Design a protein around this nucleic acid. Structure first.
Ligand SMILES: [Mg+2]
Ligand SMILES: [Mg+2]
Length: 874
RNA sequence: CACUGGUGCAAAUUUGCACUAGUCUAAAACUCCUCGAUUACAUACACAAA
């Protein structure tokens, strides 16, 4: 069983090191740090900074090698914990640890204007680098999705569209480049992007993102919509220019300041988008939430109605229940599993979300207002826990106490969870003034432009993508705010003036809070799109249709241009089950409907995805999708059956479905919905996993360009080098320096001669041409684009990593039909014979990333790649 | 099945293993928030309708 660090469990958050002192911190609420002690490195004298009430740990003996301490709150019944004194390292003169890359001094100069004899500034800086790494993944995906949206399947060019946009050009300059005072090359570049912009508008595919063109054809409304879309694309392009380098090796330095420095029209667009979302939630919130609010007021006897309304607004928009230090949902889930299993019954499926909100709200109020001490006690037990099993036990014990307290309340909620009561509560008068929430309401004016810019990015993202980007940004800003607070403390008091480009980080507290709200509002369902003919073609094509069907034929089959009563059942069925599916939208955004349908014919690929689905879920899918299920068949037979259904699905299968189903018609309709849902889920899982694998490589490219720029300032040997000429130059130069010199900036290569020698072999196996192709394929999501072309050639489909590398290797070794015979790569012959990726080829391709050994090994060895795989063998 | 530090056995000129840490390693510091993830998520029961 994996065990946690006892040092973290006991309460020691961090040991900050300066040249003469160490500062020990303990965990406060959430990410807060409690300064506990200051220790002198030379004489080991200690001074307690914490008050008797605030202190969480007791410091014992401190010496050159070890630090002994114990919890003041009972961890391990007060057991003594021994941790290394961080200043004790052989072969290092300084008490202060350096970074593995050796870029700590260059980074401190870039962010703070000078070097420091402490390890605090570098920790804050690594948090900023993490923000850039995650933005690099999402902008790369968004740019690919926008290009993909065009439908130009055969196209050498890529960034003629997003690459030529600039946030420094207003909409007027963009639409009238000639009337500009810009260079002729620039004017032509703008025209190329303008033409692509009109191409994107013509597709009608922007509706997938919630960017619907206006219903009216009025010129004024049309231009206002186009201007907003242009601002969104130009901002995405600007972010891309800040996290990736251009042809000349240059990148913009205004990522954190540009939004406040560009034309005010861009800021108007950001306000318009956020105001639209906030105004829909905020307008008549009490009337909009009257059913739950009425039930809660009747149920919560110890609270004033106005207080409940304010708490409910918090629960929906602020989601304070998600900042408690434990999972409210997990507690509710444990309560239902052990004691309220009846509420998990099929009859509550239609009202389950409402029922869970009411149950979660009671638990939230219990810990947020009524029993804050119980919440603090629960966090301490979870922090003290050393294993996953212990943590589950803590949630289970808490659920048992909660059931005794809320059993009657939960039964009461379940009694009201039916259509008759809900319809009744909906029609009932709600005499509460909407102005009660004026003090709690969140408005667009309350947020920074940086926060609004992040909200704008969410239009292009799926809920999982929003969760991944936002939770990562929130965590990094929270860490940065804490590091600044520690450095500015009376006890530490070290200079930390950020340079002009990074002044935004001074507002890291406010940004962390605003970003949390952005995650909540961005995660909410947007109004359904007006389905356009393009979407209907996408839906019929993904299901399976004649390759040469005309737009007029699609209109005819779905009666799109026909007016009448009850004649649109098929159109409505396709809209509800395909067009409105987030899984379908994800597939159209990153893939091609016709290509995905062809990939679905490959039973080995579909069986691989089905294999990952839990056995209980396969049984549910088998029962819902198969008309006459053989329940006595094996799980492999059931998976094999579902794979055959997916291979044979077509639009034709659903042409007679009855959308307004009566009686027995319902059985066929439910089965059709189940089959479409499984088909979309299986294809979505495959594409999403490949996009996710690609993201790891995108981080590697972003880091290599960033690291090359930093190393270039301190390595004379890199002085005349251009990275794009040969991507292997950083690893090659650093490996050579380790062999020929004594001093080394890069510790990964210097410390591990065996791994350094391995990287040297991998560099030699590669060349400038193949590495350049790899970087281009990673940046353009070529593996996802060309998946249908090569996935069929894989003999055994056993991992996302192996699928990605096989397709990538086929793309790299493809001999251009337009170009002449080029230096055939030495791995091509075996790859074509093997029908599987070549392990040595991955290492050669990844040789540019060799300077960061953990990244290089994780990206080159299938067993080390995924943190969620090989848990038992790990 | 990683990387780096400390400690402890071993080991000449390769280092290896064990225990333990690390926000200054890797998508990677505790509790959260997340992801894996499919069972779904989502200010408005569901269904139908526009
Ligand atoms: Mg030393
Ligand atoms: Mg880190």
């Amino acid at each position: 069983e994996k065990k946690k660090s006892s040092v973290k469990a006991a309460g020691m958050k961090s040991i900050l090191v300066s040249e003469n002192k160490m500062y020990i911190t303990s965990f406060g609420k959430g990410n807060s740090a409690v300064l506990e002690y200051e220790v002198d490195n030379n004489d080991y004298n200690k001074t307690q900074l914490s008050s008797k009430d605030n202190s969480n740990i007791e410091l014992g003996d401190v010496n050159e090698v070890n630090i002994t301490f114990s919890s003041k709150h009972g961890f391990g019944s007060g057991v003594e914990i021994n941790t290394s004194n961080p200043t004790h390292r052989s072969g290092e003169s300084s008490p202060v640890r350096g970074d593995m890359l050796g870029l700590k001094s260059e980074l401190e100069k870039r962010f703070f204007g000078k070097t420091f004899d402490d390890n605090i500034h570098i920790q804050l800086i690594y948090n900023i680098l993490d923000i850039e790494k995650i933005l690099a993944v999402y902008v790369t995906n968004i740019v690919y999705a926008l290009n993909n949206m065009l439908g130009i399947k055969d196209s050498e060019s890529y960034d003629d569209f997003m690459g030529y946009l600039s946030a420094r050009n207003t909409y007027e300059v963009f639409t009238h480049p000639d009337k500009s005072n810009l260079s002729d090359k620039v004017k032509g570049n703008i025209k190329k992007s303008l033409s692509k912009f009109n191409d994107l508008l013509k597709t009608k595919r922007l509706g997938y993102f919630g960017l619907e063109e206006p219903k009216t054809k009025d010129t004024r409304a049309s231009e206002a919509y186009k201007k907003r879309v242009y601002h969104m694309l130009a901002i995405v392009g600007q972010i891309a220019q800040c996290v990736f380098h251009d042809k000349s090796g240059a990148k913009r330095f205004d990522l954190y300041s540009f939004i406040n420095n560009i034309d005010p029209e861009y800021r108007d667009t950001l306000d318009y988008l956020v105001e639209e979302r906030l105004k829909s939630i905020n307008k008549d919130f009490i009337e909009g939430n009257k059913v739950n609010i009425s039930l809660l007021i009747d149920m919560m006897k110890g609270y004033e109605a106005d207080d409940i309304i304010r708490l409910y607004y918090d629960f929906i928009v602020l989601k304070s229940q998600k900042n408690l230090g434990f999972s409210i949902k997990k507690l509710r889930e444990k309560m239902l599993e052990e004691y309220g299993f009846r509420f998990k019954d099929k009859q509550y499926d239609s009202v389950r979300s409402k029922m869970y909100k009411l149950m979660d709200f009671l638990l939230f109020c219990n810990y947020y207002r009524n029993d804050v001490a119980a919440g603090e006690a629960l966090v301490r037990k979870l922090r003290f826990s050393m294993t996953d099993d212990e943590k589950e036990g803590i949630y289970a014990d808490e659920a048992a106490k909660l059931w005794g307290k809320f059993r009657n309340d939960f039964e009461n909620i379940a009694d009201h969870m039916n259509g008759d009561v809900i319809k009744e509560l909906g029609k009932a008068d709600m005499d509460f003034d909407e102005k009660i929430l004026d003090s709690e309401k969140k408005n667009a004016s309350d947020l920074l432009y940086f926060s609004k810019m992040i909200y704008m990015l969410t239009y292009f993202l799926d809920g999982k993508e929003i969760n991944d980007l936002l939770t990562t940004l929130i965590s990094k800003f929270d860490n940065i705010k804490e590091f600044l607070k520690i450095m500015k403390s009376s006890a530490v008091d070290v200079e930390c003036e950020l340079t002009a480009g990074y002044k935004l980080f001074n507002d890291s507290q406010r940004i962390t809070n605003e970003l949390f709200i952005v995650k909540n509002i961005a995660s909410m369902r947007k109004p359904a799109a007006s389905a356009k003919l393009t979407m209907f073609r996408d839906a019929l094509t993904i299901l399976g249709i004649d390759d040469n069907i005309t737009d007029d034929r699609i209109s005819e089959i779905l009666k799109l241009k026909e007016k009448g009563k009850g004649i649109h059942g098929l159109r409505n069925f396709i809209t509800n089950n395909v067009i409105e599916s987030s899984r379908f939208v994800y597939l159209i955004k990153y893939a091609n409907a016709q290509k995905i349908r062809e990939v679905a014919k490959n039973e080995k690929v579909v069986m691989f995805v089905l294999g990952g689905i839990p056995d209980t879920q396969i049984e549910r899918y088998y029962k819902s999708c198969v008309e006459f299920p053989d329940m006595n068949s094996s799980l492999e037979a059931k998976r094999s059956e579902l794979a055959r259904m997916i291979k044979n699905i077509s639009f034709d299968d659903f042409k007679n479905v009855k959308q307004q189903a009566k009686g027995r018609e319902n059985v066929a309709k439910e089965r059709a919905k189940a089959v479409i849902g499984l088909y979309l889920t299986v294809m979505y899982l495959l594409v999403k996993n490949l996009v996710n694998v690609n993201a790891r490589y995108v981080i590697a490219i972003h880091c290599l360009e960033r690291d090359f720029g930093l190393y270039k300032e301190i390595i004379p040997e890199l002085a005349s080098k251009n990275l794009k000429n040969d991507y292997r130059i950083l690893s090659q130069t650093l490996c050579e320096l380790c062999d020929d010199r004594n001093e080394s900036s890069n510790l990964f290569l210097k410390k591990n001669k065996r791994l350094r020698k391995c990287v040297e072999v991998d560099i030699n196996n590669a060349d400038s041409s193949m590495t350049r192709k790899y970087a281009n394929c990673i940046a353009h999501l070529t593996v996802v684009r060309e998946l249908k072309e090569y996935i069929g050639d894989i003999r055994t489909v056993d991992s996302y990593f192996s699928i990605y590398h096989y397709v990538m290797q086929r793309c790299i070794t493809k001999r251009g039909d337009d170009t002449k015979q080029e230096e055939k790569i030495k791995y091509e012959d075996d790859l074509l014979k093997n029908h599987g990726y070549t392990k040595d080829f991955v290492k050669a391709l990844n040789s540019p990333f060799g300077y960061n050994i953990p990244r290089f090994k994780n990206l080159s060895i299938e067993q080390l790649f995924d943190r969620n795989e090989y848990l038992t063998e790990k």
